[PDB]
Amino acid sequence: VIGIVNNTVYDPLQPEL
Amino acid sequence: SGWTFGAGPALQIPFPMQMAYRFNGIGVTQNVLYENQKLIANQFNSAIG
Numbered sequence A: 001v002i003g004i005v006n007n008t009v010y011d012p013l014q015p016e017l
Numbered sequence B: 001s002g003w004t005f006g007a008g009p010a011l012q013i014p015f016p017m018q019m020a021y022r023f024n025g026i027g028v029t030q031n032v033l034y035e036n037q038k039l040i041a042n043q044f045n046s047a048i049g
């Protein structure tokens, strides 16, 4: 993928469990 | 600006994403476009020529 940014993706499961 | 200028104000968008939206609009996910973007552009020139 071109110009894909190095950025974090949140997961709605790890904070919960 | 893709189709945004037709419906109102012209909203700039990178051409590859405009293509991505148009691909999504026909049932082909945008990752197909991004993974083959170079192939598609070179290929497009031969079609215009």
Ligand SMILES: *[C@@H]1O[C@H](CO)[C@@H](O)[C@H](O)[C@H]1NC(C)=O
Pocket (backbone or CB within 6 Å): A002, A003
């Ligand atoms: C976006 O355009 C700039 C030039 O203004 C260029 O240096 C940069 O590499 C481009 N990024 C992509 C992903 O094409």
Ligand SMILES: *[C@@H]1O[C@H](CO)[C@@H](O)[C@H](O)[C@H]1NC(C)=O
Pocket (backbone or CB within 6 Å): A004, A005, A006
């Ligand atoms: C993104 O992170 C990886 C791992 O640190 C690194 O190898 C790569 O060069 C980084 N790319 C950008 C766009 O900074």
